[PDB]
Each structure stands twice: as structure tokens, then as C-alpha cells.
């Protein structure tokens, strides 16, 4: 029954874990709070299913999958530096242990890999050297995991008419890339991330500058007058580098129902079922035929505080405004509501949210000034709605039709709201191995 | 399965040494600081690779080498006046436990000397009088310590192409010298560096001047006008000197994907494996053939506080300014962060340093008001960015595109941030002994 | 294992003596301070070399090395007139202890003495009367106490040509001589040091005035005008006077790496090995050969705080100023720290040294004046620096390169600072007994 995870005990994660995962009895026995988020998240779906069941693994590392009792089918395209390697530990712990255990298969996943390296076009039970949309095995049961660089719907599509029924994806939350902001943190996984055109300010998580003594005049044949998000953005998770892409990553963030519309139709759902201070499981139950109506909304819960505010810093020398994203605990959050009742200014709340922390620290302190400074702006714009009171039911446009917009520094969502954003919903469009290599990896089952 | 260092049991720096290996149990039993790092730096290396492996060691004393078990190689050049001291000391070990010892190889040592001392020019399993480029014996694992005078690209294509797949680096971080600071210090490890230009200032960890009355008016006929680092820097490690060159320090600065395209292409990663206070483990693993793709980035990432600010000088009688770094431990860092929201004096910020620091001090006291002169210039910046607040989205560079750069006096990395750094990702050009010391050698082993 | 010194057991020069040899374990059973810290010296050169080797002794005292077990070779020759005494001296311990030891070579340094009185030109095993260049014994170990008078390249090359490779030197420190200051103390000691032209002042270590009423008008014929230090200097270590050499001193302040260039080439470097309060063991390698590059820079450690400032006095009723020297406790120049912020008077930092120092008194009372009149010029000028900001990396030296000079009057360096100095590297050019005295030798050896 009860489940231990690789992590301390005076810890504050601790109880984190717990309360993502509330059907179980986590015990304690810069990397180990993701691990455990994934430790337990393949439990899950292991319990949530039927053994004897066939199990797919996009983009995967075959070494964690190697000592379990299930039917995995690990799939191994040669797409990035690090692929090589995952496959030579694979090939180094089965030659390890190729005599000392006598109850999992441990015999037959050597005999693949050497039918797999002989001939490199093999489609074998535990083992392939395809991508997920040129593999042919069938099967009803995929998994993903930290799979960032894929268009949703096209690989969702592949898996359906191969028979999968139940999928499963784990990694970041997507919602801070549908709220379009240019920077922001995962504080308890040791995340930072940020957009290219940002990389040279001086105050964020991930960023390098200069000292300068600075010029009254700079001149440019190239003007730009124009700073907004692009598609490429740099994760930095612990000390390794990830680039990824925003619409791949938005491509993941579904709605409630959708229907994929090929030679074979199917109709689908997405739910959210587990979610810990930024990482979350989701499960997609997918069905042959076009049924029912969609409406193209899907819908975050918040758990702890979501904050997203503007900022002024100065990128290469240049003064300039961009948005910031962060999470926020519950405790502080419920700590906070009568401070906010009034008009605050920012150097006030950070004294007082310093004060607050010291109960080791609930959040990193490098995150506090901009979380102060969001804040004050947030109580500053709910005082001046107060002030200038409307008509019940009605607009005031006025002759010609011409409203003024107000102005929105801050989005703030507290514990036990949720956002709702208007989606696509209806998809129709459906767009390595060599001698050096592959000797090394012969030579060791030999 | 515990180790053991051989530091005291009440300092600080023992904790450190915990929390930078937190999958080993350390126990207590000026460079005891350094020896110990080196010490447990050596252990993981051998834990993460399996025996009966053939290990290099480039440019290494053999007598540290002598007492293990593994296949060692050990390359020892004549290139430092130091050299000859090495390869004595050996050859007296040597003969001091001939036959003392009768489970580890000793004798077989003793033959390998004895044949290179006749012949001078001959590759032996565990000796050679190479350097690193034209060494001839074939292996597949490289080990580096305190390697500072060599071309990192050039070095590791030559262990490439005789069959060397893993590769380590011990020494100091590189950071400090991809910002480009005239000065800094490594406080923990008793060592402090400096540029040849400033040698003669007054207030630096290594420098040296004279009493004087000075002169409204020194004539010269030859203007420099122009203070900018150069190549040559010394570095001060207890009393021990060494130069060295900024080009080669900063080629070991590697990202995270390079390929290397010679007679024989290979595909290269870099990680960073240990990190404290200011000494780095990384490991450099290789292949063949070239694939991926290279962005050209490296990252750091920060577990304690990294400093760079602008200060004022006397050298050689002449008042200046240039950029000095240091390092700052994380707890001081925490407690600073109600004090910077406004703005302070430095001289109130140093006497509240003082206060923090009697918990036997935390830090070094000659590094205290350079710190406490760089956090209230930082606060003072902090403040002008708030007061002068741009539109979102919009950079105002106005008819012809001019636009102002703001003066940055101070670079400030808190705990658990990144810096991003852009470096060069695709390379393709790769540019003793004698009768007295001879006879020497030869007379103790006979 | 244990090593016991005979000093006092509530003295703090206990704590200094065991942190200046961290590897013994040293223990409690107006000299006693100079003798201790020379017996341990002699202790660790024993440990640190393999017994059955030949030991010369520069300029020694022969009755201290009698009762020990290695072969040491003394060097007498008659240069001063305290040299009779400490041969008759050994005649008589020799004579008084011919039968009282059967272990350790007693009767054949009684058969070389009365050999060498016999015919005082033979170079006999134990004993010579020789100077340290027109001895002709060969060797490998060379070992020098208290030697001042000697040019060092000239010696040292001269124990080369005849096979030693590794010497040592103990002495007082050679830094204040380097600084060129014109008086200084050694605290620890009990020792004053002052140049010929100062004897007559007032108010330092060692001088001697007069009572008078003073006239306001002492013409003279002869005109000065100028105080700068010359070559003779007066030490006193408790009541015994020494007369030295500025130029003898410095020499023996040597880089890190030095080659001597005569009819046989040498590469040389020079460590520091001890250091404790003033008192230093330097040890030097030697080895045939020129090899290795020079830069000519010597590094000393500051283990405790040294100061250098300028004084006013009168010396022989005309009041001057000059520069001054001393060494300051580390655990005092800590608790300075926060008072040194900020501008202090003389006076205030002279009550504040008064209440630190009742803790029995840390540091001399007779030093403290001059120490608090550093402290708060240093103060001064750190301020002056601080509002007089330059721009980063220019130099503004105006229409004619001429530059002012800033006036500096306190030169103080902190613990964990390093001292640098550029000195000369490259070395190619090498420049008593009576019958009386014989007879009374003789007769006690009858
Ligand atoms: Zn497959
Ligand atoms: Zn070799
Ligand atoms: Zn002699």
C-alpha cells in the first residue's frame, strides 16, 4: 500500500506531494522534486489500468522501463545529442544484468536490441528506431513524458487508427504560454525560462549583462519600435538548456472536447488529473465516430496563486516593459487579503512578505520584489473600479461608437478560481543509427 | 560506503562540501579546502564508471596516481620548472615501497620508469614523456586537474580520435573571465587574481604600492588614456603564483551541444556535475559523426550570490575605475532582502554586513565593503527603472533612430538564477629530459 | 608524536605557535618565543628529508647540533667577535660529555676538532673553519639560522656546484625591507629596528633624546634637505645589538622561480613554508639545467594585518617625518571592521584599541598610538576615493599628458591579502685563529 518517495522529511514539498496525490500514503525514505512527481504520476496510470495491457512510449529512454512488469514498447527516434546515450545505458544494464534476475523478461529484451542493431528497420515487441508518426506496431495504450516538440492533434491522430484508446502526457503547465507572456518561473523545480529578446536584461531568472558607463546617443539604421513575444523560447531547468517552441507548446493546452476528423473520425476528451505548483498529469480518452457538440473552452483550476504583471528593465542598456509570470502559495495568498483591502505601496508589501516567509522560506526570495510590486498594482486598479460606478445593464458608448479601454496591469487569480480561453476545436489537416554506433552497441550483448 | 575528508569538524566549510555531494555521507577526520574537493572529485569519477578501464591523465604528477587501482596512464611533459620535482618524487616512492606492498602493482611500475629513463621516446602502459597532443597510446576515458594553459578544442579532438569517449575537468569556474572583470577573488580557497595593469593599486586582494606626498603635475610624453583587460592575469593560490591566459581560460567555458569537423567528425555535450563556491566538476562526453542541431548557448547556474561592480582606485598614484567580482555566500543574500528595497547608504549597508556576519565569520572581512559599496548601487538602480516606466510592447526610439543606453554600475546574480552566455559552437581548425636529471632518476631505482 | 616547547601554558603565543605548524601537536612544558619557533623549524627540516643524509650548516654555533643523530657538517669561520665563545664552548661540552653516551658519535667530533687545531687548513667530516664560498665538503642539504650578512644568489650558487639541491633559511621576515620603511617592530619578539639617521628621535622603539629649550634660530653650513633611508640599520632583540644591510636583507627576498646562470646552470624556486607573527622558513629546490620562463615577482601571505604609515617626530630637536612599520593581531583588525566605515579621530580610535585590548593585553601597549593614527588616515582616504568617481575604463589625462597625483599616507594590508613585488630573476655574475686561542682549545681536549 503505502508509497515512499526519494526526497527529505523537514522538507515543505512533503506535503505538496501529499496533497496532489490524496488516494495514497507518500513517506520519505536540484532534480529530486520532479523525480518524485513522475515516480508517482507512472504509478497512477499503472493502477488506473488493466495489466496484460500492451503500453506505447513516445520519445523515450528504454533504461527506466527496463526492470518493470508491464507490456512497454519503447519507441527511440535519433532526434537530439542526447539519444545515443540513452540508447548505449540500455544496451550496458542489460549485458549487467543479463543472469541475475529470473522472474521479469530479461532475456528477450536483449534478443531485440541485437535483432534491431543487425537490421536497422525492424519492427520488434520492445524496441524500434521510429518516430511516432512513421512506427507501425498497434497498440491501445501511449504515454508521454517531457515530450515538448510535437503538434498534438497529428501525433494524437497516428495513435488512433493504431487502436490507442487512453493516453497520457506529464510536464509543465501550459497555461502561462496561452496568457502570451515574455518571461516567467517554475520556482520549486529549479525553472527559469524566457523568450530570445529578452535575454540580455539585467533582473529576471535567466538572463547576462554588462557594466556600462551608457550614452545620450546611440544611433540605429534599423529601428524596431516593436517588442512582442516570438515562437522560440529557452528553458533552463536545474543547469541544462532546453530550446522549445511556443506553438507546440500551445498545441498542448486542449479543450474539453474535440474531434479529429481523418479517413477514420473519432471524438475525444482532455481532463486534468493531477496538478502540483506547475507540473500536471492529463488523461485523453479517445472513440471512434463523430459525436456530441463542442464548444472550444478549456478550463484551468488554481490550486495556489497565478500572477502575471508588467515590469521595467533595461535589455543591452535599453529601458523597456515586458510581462512576467509566477506562482504563488496558498498560504501566502490567504495571508495577504486584508493587507490588500487598501492602497499599499510596493517597498510596504515587500516588507511585510519578507516578514511572512521566515516561517527556510515557503518561496525563493528572488521572486519577492516583482510579487510585491503586482500586488500593489492589483489593490491600486480594484480602488479606482470602486470610484467610478456604472449603470446597472447598460454601456455608455455615446453619437459614434467609441469607448474608452482602461488599463491592465496586473492578472491576478487567487486559490479556488479558474481561467476559461476559447480554443480550437474541430482538426481535420494532418501534415541516424551508424557503423561507429552501432558497433559499440553490438559489441556489449555480444 | 562513507567518506572521509581531512578538514575539522567545526567549520564551515564542511557543510558546503555536504550539500555539493549529496549522494555521499562526509565526515570530518591553507588548501585543506581545495585538497578536499579534489579529493572527493576523484571518488565520483571512479563510482561513475565501471573498472578495468584505461584512464589518461594529462599533465599529472604520478605520485598522487601511484596507490589505486585502475588502469592509469600517466602523461607528464617537461613544461614548468615544477616538472622535474614531480618525476623525482616518484622515482623515490618508488623504491621507498618496493616491497612492502603485494596487492597492488608496484613492480611493474618500477620497470615502465626505468625504460623510459633508457629510453626516452618510448610509450609504456603507465608512463610517457608526451604532451597531450603528441601522446600515441589509445584509450577511452580523459582526466583533467588544474589544466589552465591549454586550448580546450584542440586538446579533446586529439583524445578523439584515439578512442576517448568521457572526459572530466577539475578546476575553477570560469565565469568571472566571461564577464570580463580586471579583478576578483575566490575567497573560500584562499586565492585572489588580478590583472598585470593593476598590480600597483592599493585596495585589492593581490596588489602592491608606496607612500608618496604626489605631484600636481606628471608629464608624459606617452598617452594611454584607455584601461581595458588584457591577456596576461595572476592568479595568487595561498603564496603560490601562477600566470595565465584569459583566451585559454575562457576556451573551457564549452555550451551544451559543439561538434568538432576534422579527418573523423564527432558530436559533443557538456554538463556541469559539481558545483562550490566558486570549484566545478564537468563532464564532457563524445561520439562519432555529426548530428543535432547547436544553438551556441552555455548557462550557469547559481547556488550561491555572484557580485561585479564598479570601483574606485589608486594605481600607481593615478586615481581609475575598473569592475571587480566575488562571490557571496546565500544565506547573507537571504537576509539582505528587506533591506534593498530602499535605498541605503554604504555605509549603513556595511555595518549591517558586520552585525550579519558574527555567526567565526561567515565571510572574509577584506571582501565586506566592496560588497556593501555593490548592493546599494544596485538598490539605487532598482529605483530609477521603477520611477521611469515605459508602454508595453514599445520601444520609443522616436525621427531618427537614436536612442539613450542607462549607466549600469553593478551585476548582481541572486541565489537560484541563470546566466546565459553566447559562445562559439562549430570548430574545425586545430593548430627536456637530460643526463644530470637522467642519472638521477636512474640511480634510485637501480 | 607529541612535540613539547618550553614556554608557559596561559601565554597567547601558545595559539600562534600551534596554528603556524597545524601537523604537530604542540605542547606546554625575554627569548623563549624566538627559541621555540627555531626548534620546531629544525624539527620539520628532519621530517621532511630521508635520515643518512649529509647536512652542512652555514655559519653555525656547533654545540646545538652535537647531540643530535644526522651528519651535520658546521661551518665556523671567525667573523665576529662572539665566534671564539661558541667554539670554546664546544670544546668544553665535548670534554664534559667524552663518557657519559655510548650511542650517539660522541669521540670522533673530539678527534676532528683536535685535528683541525692542529692543522687549521684540513676539511674534516664534523667541523671546518671556513666561510660558506671557500669550503670545498661536499653535499646535498644545506641549512642557514640567522644569516643576514650574506649576498644569497652568490651563496646559493656555491652549495650548487658542489650537489645540494634543497636548502633552507630561517629569519625574520624580509617584507618591511621590501616596503623600504624607515623603522619597525617585530612585537612578538621583543624586537625594534631603526635606520642610523633616526636614533635620535623621540617616540619609536629604539632611539634616545634629550631634554632642551630650543632656540628659533641654528644656523648651519651644511644643508641637507633631504631624509630618505640608506643601507645601515641598527636591530636590538631584547639587549642585543645587530648591526645589518639594506641590500643583504633584500636579497634573500626571492620570486618564485630563478635561474643562476654560471659555468653550471641552474632553475631554482622558493617557497614559504612557516609563518608565524614575523618569523618565517623558506625552502628552496635547485637542479641542474636552465628550463621554464621567469616572471620576476615575489608573493608574500598576510596571515595577520600589516600596517605602514607616516609619522611626525623630532629627531635632535628638528621635527620630520618619516614611515614606520608593525604587525597587528587578526583577531583585532576584525573587530575594526564596522568603526572603519565611517571617519574617526585619532583619539576615539585610541580608546576603542584600549577597550579591545584588555582581553593580560593582546598586542604591546607602546605600539598602540601609532597603530590608531593609521587606522583613521586610512579611513580618510577610503572616503575620498569614494566621492571623486571616475568613468569606467578611461583614463583622463587631458592637452599635454600631464596627470595629478593623489598623496597616500597609510599603506594597511588585511588578513587573507597578498603582497606582490616585482624583483630581479636572471643571476649570471658572482663575486682568524691564534695560538693563545689555539692553545687554551687544546688543553681541554688533553
Ligand atoms: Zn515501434
Ligand atoms: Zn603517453
Ligand atoms: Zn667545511
Known amino acids: 500500500d ?35 512527481f513522475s515516480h508517482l504520476a507512472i504509478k497512477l496510470i499503472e493502477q488506473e489500468i488493466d495489466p496484460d495491457s500492451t503500453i506505447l512510449d513516445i520519445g523515450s529512454a528504454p533504461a527506466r522501463r527496463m526492470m518493470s512488469d508491464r507490456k512497454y514498447h519503447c519507441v527511440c527516434p535519433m532526434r537530439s545529442a542526447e539519444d545515443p546515450e540513452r540508447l548505449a545505458n540500455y544496451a550496458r544494464k542489460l549485458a549487467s544484468a543479463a543472469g541475475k534476475v529470473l522472474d521479469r523478461n530479461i532475456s528477450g529484451k536483449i534478443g531485440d536490441l541485437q535483432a534491431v542493431m543487425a537490421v536497422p528497420d525492424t519492427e520488434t515487441p520492445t524496441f524500434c528506431l521510429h518516430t ?21 492533434p497529428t501525433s494524437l491522430y497516428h495513435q488512433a487508427i493504431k487502436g490507442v484508446r487512453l493516453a497520457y502526457w506529464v510536464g509543465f503547465d ?3 504560454f496561452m496568457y502570451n507572456a515574455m518571461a516567467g518561473a517554475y520556482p520549486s523545480y529549479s525553472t527559469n525560462w524566457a523568450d ?66 481523418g479517413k477514420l473520425s473519432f471524438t475525444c476528451r482532455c481532463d486534468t488529473v493531477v496538478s502540483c505548483e506547475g ?57 495577504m487579503t486584508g ?33 510585491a510590486q503586482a500586488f500593489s498594482k492589483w489593490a491600486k486598479e480594484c480602488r479606482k473600479d470602486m470610484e467610478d460606478e456604472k449603470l446597472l445593464g447598460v454601456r455608455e458608448r455615446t453619437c459614434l461608437w467609441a469607448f474608452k479601454k482602461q488599463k491592465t496591469h496586473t492578472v491576478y487569480k487567487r486559490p479556488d478560481t479558474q481561467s476559461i480561453q476559447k480554443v480550437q476545436a474541430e482538426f481535420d489537416s494532418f501534415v541516424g543509427l551508424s557503423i561507429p554506433l552501432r558497433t559499440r552497441i553490438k559489441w556489449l550483448l555480444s
Chains 1, 2, 3 share one sequence.
Open 132 to 152: 511516432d508518426v512513421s512506427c507501425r506496431q498497434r497498440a491501445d495504450v501511449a504515454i508521454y513524458q517531457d515530450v515538448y516538440a510535437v503538434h498534438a
Open 174 to 176: 501550459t497555461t502561462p
Open 279 to 335: 507540473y500536471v498529469v492529463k488523461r485523453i480518452t479517445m472513440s471512434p465516430g463523430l459525436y456530441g457538440k463542442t464548444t472550444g473552452y478549456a478550463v484551468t483550476h488554481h490550486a495556489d496563486g497565478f500572477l502575471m504583471c508588467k515590469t521595467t528593465d533595461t535589455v543591452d542598456g535599453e529601458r523597456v516593459s515586458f510581462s512576467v509570470c509566477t506562482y504563488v502559495p496558498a498560504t501566502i495568498c490567504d495571508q
Open 2 to 36: 503505502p508509497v515512499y518517495v526519494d526526497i527529505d522529511a523537514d522538507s515543505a514539498f512533503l506535503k505538496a506531494l501529499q496533497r496532489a496525490y490524496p488516494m495514497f500514503e507518500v513517506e520519505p525514505r536540484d532534480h529530486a522534486n520532479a523525480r518524485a
Open 339 to 371: 493587507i490588500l483591502a487598501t492602497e499599499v505601496t510596493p517597498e510596504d508589501a515587500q516588507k511585510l512578505l519578507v516578514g511572512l516567509n521566515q516561517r527556510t522560506n515557503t518561496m525563493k526570495n528572488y521572486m519577492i520584489p516583482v510579487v
Open 196 to 261: 530570445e529578446q529578452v535575454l540580455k536584461a539585467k533582473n529576471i531568472g535567466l538572463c547576462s549583462t554588462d557594466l556600462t558607463e551608457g550614452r545620450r546617443g546611440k544611433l540605429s539604421i534599423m529601428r524596431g519600435k516593436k517588442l512582442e513575444p516570438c515562437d522560440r523560447v529557452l528553458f533552463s531547468v536545474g543547469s541544462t538548456l532546453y530550446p522549445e517552441s511556443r506553438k507546440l507548446l500551445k498545441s498542448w493546452h486542449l479543450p474539453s472536447v474535440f474531434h479529429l476528423k
